[PDB]
Amino acid sequence: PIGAQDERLSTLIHQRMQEAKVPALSVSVTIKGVRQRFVYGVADVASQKANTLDTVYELGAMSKAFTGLVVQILIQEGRLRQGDDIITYLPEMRLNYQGKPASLTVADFLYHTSGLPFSTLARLENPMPGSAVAQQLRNENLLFAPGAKFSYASANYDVLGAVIENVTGKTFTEVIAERLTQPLGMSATVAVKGDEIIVNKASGYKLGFGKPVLFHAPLARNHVPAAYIHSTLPDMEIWIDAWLHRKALPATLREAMSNSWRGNSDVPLAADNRILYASGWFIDQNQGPYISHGGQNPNFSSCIALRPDQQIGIVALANMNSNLILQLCADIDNYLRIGKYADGAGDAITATDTLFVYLTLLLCFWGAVVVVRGAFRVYRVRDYIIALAVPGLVAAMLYVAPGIMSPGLDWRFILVWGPSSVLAIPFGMILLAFVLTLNHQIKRIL
Amino acid sequence: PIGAQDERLSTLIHQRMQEAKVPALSVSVTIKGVRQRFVYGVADVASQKANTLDTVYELGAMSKAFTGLVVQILIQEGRLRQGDDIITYLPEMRLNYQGKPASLTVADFLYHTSGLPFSTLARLENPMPGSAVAQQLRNENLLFAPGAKFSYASANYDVLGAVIENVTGKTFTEVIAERLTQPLGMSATVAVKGDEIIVNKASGYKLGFGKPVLFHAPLARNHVPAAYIHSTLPDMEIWIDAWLHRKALPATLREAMSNSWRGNSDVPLAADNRILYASGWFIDQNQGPYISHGGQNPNFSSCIALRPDQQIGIVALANMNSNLILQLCADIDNYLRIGKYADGAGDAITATDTLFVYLTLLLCFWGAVVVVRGAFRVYRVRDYIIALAVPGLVAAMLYVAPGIMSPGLDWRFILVWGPSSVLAIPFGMILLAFVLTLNHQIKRIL
Ligand SMILES: [Cl-]
Ligand SMILES: [Cl-]
Ligand SMILES: [Cl-]
Ligand SMILES: [Cl-]
Ligand SMILES: [Cl-]
Ligand SMILES: [Cl-]
């Protein structure tokens, strides 16, 4: 009775999938009760394990709507106030502004008005077994007064995870399960505790030399509330369906939802962007309301978009980081709205991969110019010690160069988020520097 | 009775003015009937002529709201249809898509859904005495099907200027005066016919080597409807006031206004931008409605913003191109809304000026290394002919390099829009290339 799914929808999704080169991609579209599912590709490439509805994905920053709804549930029960100071729950977290400890509220983390620098993502995403969030951020220097500006920082929702635990006295996992996944019936959603083996989880990939490459990304327990809630497409359908049909929902959960979609208007807006952030969702009233959020991980990415007044919900899930997946929801919504859609935008990882492939061939053409000029002059101890300084000196500068241009970012961070080809640039430079040393020393020796 | 103007408003405006380094800046703010005026600096620097309320500015792209309201007036009278094909009025303008002539409507130019490439701005802004717009754009190749995408192109409103003339049988100047400036009472607003002398017009400036520099910019008659309507602050106050109080207005002008603020929803929207374009205005419903448009000329810039439901109107006018002036209206509106505002954004011209100043000193440090190494070896006909090839060859490549990287842009365009320092880079390269030739030829001569 429901009829066939839309064939022009399938073309768009396929095309975006082939452009992005993600191995697996799952998409689901609700329009007033009728869903359309699009499940393509492979969750694991080497074993050829198929993308099925049981495949489990990391939700990326779409984790934050879970964390924030829980903050709203605890507020609705009266175990928390939006305006509570964070020090009441995280007594050891001193965060500074202009040298003085600052007053940061719970709202300041909900709405990314905290001033936490971008580098806090490097700190919170590296595993630290016996280390609490408050110690990891202790004595960070904020970028502005709290509440003065919107500035997205993923670590803002790891502070909130830690507040949930102090308030309930329970682990994040238990609070998520007991307050959200059990009562909504999302029987395959979970907040993980680390990288214990999750059956059905897709393998994650990252672009490198033009092909997807298997990448085992870190999964730090303290970072779960901002990045690493795991789920499946049927479950995200139930999640969508809940936000759209809050009638048969208990009154606490319904009220917490209503307050979870209340954007923070007390910030400056740009000339081209008056969109508001709520409790882990962007709120846009233009051709709206249009509630969306994207997920971006080192080896996963995803998006979600809701248009409540027309009962539309879009979610897409993929086991690779691609801007074409962060935009796919806007594409699908353009199609559902006016029957047309833009050409795929670019992708930052893919452009960077190409840049390195060129640079690496450039560094290889240079090695040939040195060795072709070398077998020319060749066919016609203190040397070995001096020539190891040129590569070892460039390799030393390359080592500390990240920490100087951007204080707080290290090579670990670069490797985690960049193309797999990113290591060829230093080593190619190291190899080119070693050979260039031997040439200009053996040319004075003639 | 009205009270003092707001002192925190004055600080913000002063500060933005000193950051941007514009010589003169005029700002006016309406909030339910009470205006606040801020008139600072100098309209002409060499003669020290003061910025007064009589100072006349080029409105930049804020010209388009004038052109488009006239299109709406002619539509309301029934002398034009939104959906009319452009060829009915510009019979010689053939514009191609995929090799075939395309059907472009009047709406396609109103809402920047035409496919006109960015380079059409270079063509329409260079003076051409006996040359009509339709001949200047004849056989351009569009970037996409008409109506398929929003893509801003200033030449879209020069096509509309030409439609107004064919329909009325009158010049653009006469139609603007008779339909808008006379009936609204804006007795100092005019659409110019070229660079005849306009008493009271401010001098225009462009950044160069860190200081503002007097710049005589082109003013091509065919480009007036998109860039070069001239006006004053009292007159822009009357303009604002008209859009906000359409009651005592004749019914044709009131209806044309209502249709002039109707955004075009039939385009794809980005994930972070669902704002619509209307008849020369951006329409944003977020914290709105917020109707705005900025003006950007080579040596002027300006902005306007209206919030009709709260009777707010902001306009700013300056005799230099600065992003800090394109954003000033958003700043003022943030202040009027929540009493706070962001730090000034960057400026593309100023960053580019600094980049060149560094490059030019780099090219000068290189000349010293060559001449210091030269007076060293010096104190211890076929040469003059060979050494003029290195600079003349680099000067040839520099000449055609713009037309190769971006087809349709020439050095004329670069000089018009870039920092005054932009010429030092080629000539410094030319001088460095000539000296480098003499060094490696007189070093083989030893
Ligand atoms: Cl509990
Ligand atoms: Cl445990
Ligand atoms: Cl935003
Ligand atoms: Cl007439
Ligand atoms: Cl004339
Ligand atoms: Cl837009």
TrEMBL record, chains A, B:
Known EC number: 3.5.2.6
Cellular-component GO terms for this entry: membrane; outer membrane-bounded periplasmic space
Disulfide cross-links: C303-C329
Predominant subcellular localization, coarse grouping: membrane
Broad class of enzyme this protein falls into: hydrolase
UniProt GO BP: antibiotic catabolic process; response to antibiotic
Catalysed reactions, semicolon-separated: a beta-lactam + H2O = a substituted beta-amino acid
Chain ranges of the Beta-lactamase-related domain: 11-321
A Pfam family annotated for this UniProt entry: Beta-lactamase
UniProt keyword annotations, A-Z: Antibiotic resistance, Hydrolase, Membrane, Signal, Transmembrane, Transmembrane helix
Source species, domain of life: Bacteria
GO molecular function: beta-lactamase activity
Residues annotated as transmembrane: 355-376, 381-401, 413-438
Family statement drawn from the similarity comment of this UniProt entry: Belongs to the class-C beta-lactamase family.
Stated name of the protein: Beta-lactamase
Gene transcribed to yield this protein: clbP
